[PDB]
RNA sequence: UGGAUGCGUUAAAAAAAAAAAAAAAAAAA
RNA sequence: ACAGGAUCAAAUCUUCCUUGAGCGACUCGGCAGGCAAAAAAAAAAAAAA
RNA sequence: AUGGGUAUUAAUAGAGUUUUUAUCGGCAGUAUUUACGAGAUGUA
């Protein structure tokens, strides 16, 4: 390139469920749950323990170790990609607005994503 | 009830309903209402409705006032009405009901004539027009204050909408108004008017009196009254062009019609094509978004007002004609009878 | 358009009420054994469901002719299916617009001097 | 949006895409083509908008005029969106329209200008369509033959122009497609009617042809010799870009006689002309290559010309490639072995920022040249060594021929990251 | 990544190469495996927030008919003007009002505006411009899943700018009811959508997989830009969503359904690694699924799709493995420690052997298209240079036997001469069959020679004889195009058919060269293998000889004469880029066609591989060819070859 | 398993506070 | 918006200038929600099918 | 490399997919709302 082309920042500046560049990891609790369930599924299917985990309805996934190794490599690459992109976006947000999302400090209904009610 | 329902006040508002605010807000509302209209960008003529009977009465009275004589009089003079007179000086002129009958006759004649006129599809006519009926019911035991409520409810509504309105109220004395409306609808249908495009245009209340009864109390005798009133309703059959401009362009659709459409779709009494067929009239959201689509198509000059009007009119007329033909066929009528019925 | 739901013109129909939860289209077809439907049972018989799929207890059955529909109604009205007698209704109009002939509404409702009823 | 793009309101144009997106399917195809061109003109990438535009134009592409197709493809090229799915379809459509061939809309049938515009778009997007280039070569050879056949001097250049010839040659050079017959035909036409060829066109054609073809060929050598004669004749009219291209071409050529004297005189003339372009702060050219050519084979650059060129090199930094960085560093190191400390510092800072853009060998040679041209400030020297070290580990690169942590005292004093307090004022 | 994007944008040596417009294929996409998405469920919860306040019957937007190329007249008086218009224009002018067939008949009787060809009186115009047969079909959004298959079949039977709305609606509805459709119905729906999307398709010349046989102006070829292969028939999201359903209900697919599924995935050029591996493991000879239950056509389709997908899957896996370095995290301590220190087979054998057994057992009940595609796919590379890492030679011997039996039956079988397009396609298929035979022979011989280190000809003749004559006949019968060596007429169908012919020629030349190597292969035991390796890798070696071919020497000479005859008149442009070295080597064996080949190599130098460049260099050196431009390209470009 | 009240308990600090109902360069809606 | 501009040209991470106060601030633009039903001391509590 | 056919990492025009509780009874029918431009000086 001789004249650099500038990518549009609107994907970063548009906050809605229809903009993935911004809603991909939102809310953080459900992002963590998604990552945990993906890991559990990978461990219970691509690393079988000889028993049916029953986490989901059965699938006819490959069982040959040669195929399982490549599937595991693919999943590891996907995990690394997601982690790195989340880290980079968090760093950019911190450097721009000083906004930072952390882990919950107390056991409260809001941290559980539930409404506070008389019960 | 909800106990938090917002009940409206026409004269005061929290947001500020002083007279200057009313002026500004109603200017905004008028602008929006006018901009809601889509108008054809090409027409051949601008025909306007006229009432020959009313014009002739006006000229007759103007001549009487200007010359002091009936039109054609040469010797005698006009004689105004006096106490005890049994002769009507304007007896030669038609009555109001006669003028209405002549209006219906003229509307029928013009409707027949328009079917053989070239360029009839590119003519603008406007709001007024069509046939008019005036129906009166007397001896209603209700007062002005309640009749005003019940008539303000129904003024401007389609006849079936008004009947549904008044039937939902569960009021014993509204049975008089319901009887009047039912009888008027039956009469217009028998005379050949299209019930689908008959609206209540105006009402008039005429007192007749009040029957008084004694009411004996501790220190005085009172008189309690039972009212006697008459109601006159003005029904109008909208011409097809006005019906199209109202329902299709301005999205002012009878709720009775929309409810019938929704019931048909829910009960699956029509095909899946009916959803897109009735999209322009079905629900508030569909009506709003179709109005937006029409506005965009008009502003890009892809929408054609005259072609759309012709399509709507043809579809309506063909549906009615199919109804007539198939109800005749359900009787086992002969082909000759069916053919002659169309002449 | 082969499907009845797709046809612009629907065959003669009947509406059935009183159906238990167990009722199936095959059960309705057996109930109407000996009567000519507008097509195979999967199209001629349509049980009515809510948004969650729960049976409403109402069914629509399509026949090849109005004569057959009326014969079926005459023969099967108040006949039993799964221990409950079923009620059958015509479910199509005449085109005559009989609703225009409304009855005269009472102008002498003397509520306080008449017997009690749930009209 | 078109007006905003023309006015350079890039931010406003970018914001308006939010409301543009849900309306692309409703606009007219020529409106969409103009939208794409407007976005490309400011070099603003909006991939969602461009994808939506492509989906909307899918059913209308075949009926679009050639000018509108060129506008759409030029917008894509300017945005550097590599939609080869669109490029292939446009190439097929243009070929079909030309085969059939053989005021608000514009003609469906294209012209040589439209073909050359699409070819330049393909060069920008690195789309090497050999079939399309074969078609273009055949058409251009026929056009050259007809132009030579023309006799009355009024119908010459009727279908094309010297600028069109230059654009064709540049297209083929950039795409690295060696159409020997086409290049020879272009050189023959240039020889036949060189008196009508602008000197800038001659310089560009000579540059591209010498870079592409061997100069040992008899015809190529003769034509290049005549072109060099005319260019040395017309040096006083040339701008900085044409001067740099002429300097490169005069050295890449292989003349029959006075090979060294020709290059020496060309360089002397270029030096004399550069001083006359001191204030030309608008033209874009290869300062690094010009400096390298001037400082080569032991030749020493004139002090004034070197100062002017290094002063002007600051404008081009935002346009530099890794190879441009390496070449400029090489030129500065050679000239020292004069030194432009500010230019070296800017180069070091920019390469530290853009470290990822460099291959192992490129980065190693660039750092060597940076050190040899007068070492940059430690603030850049130290982290650059760390980056080179990391790159060598990652790429397992260790050539046969082959520090500390930063200290607060090494930070620039213009900033105030040290706790020291100084007498003076901060004039806002 | 941004770094890799910048690398590509900076590179002056990397290009997207295409000899002809139809070369460009959609980028290959690998579809990751699925897992529960509570986050996406949350987003859906938000999206459905206000359904109670909306319409219960048409919540979605009304489709917008595509607009015309030019704006309409300012007064917008189409009915008055009276000129008939397109169906979409009619709908927009009517404000998207439905026009059933009887209404259209009436309105056509009255006014000519409704008398356009797109307005069929027996169909209607539809509420959004749906013309012809589609006008009678209800919108897919409202159709129940149990009727979608019949709806799609009726829609496809119709085979116009408003058809895309219907087909996009169908795709969306299928994606929504993927989990309600029966699996077989889902496969058939995908096939129907692919057929509609790619109707009027032309295969890339250099690509092997093809869904259907080519048999079913001057030629029978029509090149439509709107349906080039680069247009992906299906959206990747639909395939991604359907992968989970297929994996859950894979055991209920019949052999034809599995073949159709693989065909659709290969047609769209999207791969799911898990699904492909599961399909490979499900089927084996005599794995509760028999490869013999397949018919020959379905078997060939399945094998071709699987190979087409797996090759690119392996390539992407390798490239991503190379990329993973920069995603990995390294520390400065490890970096310093580093200097302290300083101071390709993707078929499982159980499946390859089964496929070879199937071919050997049923070679006699194949067609040219099916057998050639299956054999060429099963052969592919065969690790011929490097030579589980490799398959057992027994399977390759069975494949060679299958080729021989098929050739024996097919020679007796009679041929049909149709359009030049079909004839060229068949010629290319025969050339690819010859290539597969040559690769089988070379692999078997290399295994035997390696064994020695540690310690069919008739079918080839028949194929060569057929090719050498059919090539000349097609060249004579095909119109003449201009030569690279007021526009000039160059028809695209003619160009494409010429490319087909030249691809067949290149495949034949490659097969001949590989046969030469296999025959040369039989101290000396290792010397022969080293010689073969040097010839294939482009290192210095003694000039090859025709005598090695033996019984095929005359056939090779006749093929070379035919190729010279073609290249002399048609020119060199249009040759496949993957066989220029093979053609040069054949010319070297047999010693204006040579000049044409050299000029084309010079023109395409930037797109050629380093191995091809080395082979061409040494072939020219042995031939004593002295092209002054090929010399310049060989000696002044591609440092990777100049320095060695 | 709970509700209300004081005959029960707590506070008596903030007022530029607690809080609110009308973002206003919009000068003829 | 690091969006536009200047310069012998900026530590990674802009040396400055412009952006009247980058619309009061942050968002949305198929946003927004008056009535019914069902609930309901102020409030809160049901995704769609 | 008397130097840029030149070395490194294009996911590239596509980073795309509906969670949990729950034996059984009940609500979810409607209306308003965004082009208050002169599309247009129509694509040169």
UniProtKB/TrEMBL annotation, chain A:
The record's similarity note reads: Belongs to the bacterial ribosomal protein bL19 family.
Span within the full-length protein is 378 to 496 of 744
Q: What is this protein called?
A: 50S ribosomal protein L19, chloroplastic
TrEMBL record, chain B:
Leader sequence residues:
none
- Molecular-function annotations in GO: structural constituent of ribosome
Q: Which GO terms describe its biological process?
A: translation
Q: Which GO terms describe its cellular component?
A: ribosome
**Organism superkingdom:** Eukaryota
User: Under which name does UniProt file this protein?
Assistant: Ribosomal L22p/L17e protein
**Organism per entry:** Toxoplasma gondii (strain ATCC 50611 / Me49)
Q: Which residues of the full protein are shown?
A: 231 to 573 of 573
UniProtKB/TrEMBL annotation, chain D:
**The protein, known as:** Uncharacterized protein
What part of the full protein is here? 406 to 911 of 1012
Automatic annotation (TrEMBL), chain E:
Q: What is this protein called?
A: Uncharacterized protein
Shown chain mapped onto the complete sequence: 225 to 1103 of 1112
Q: Where does the source fall among the domains of life? A: Eukaryota
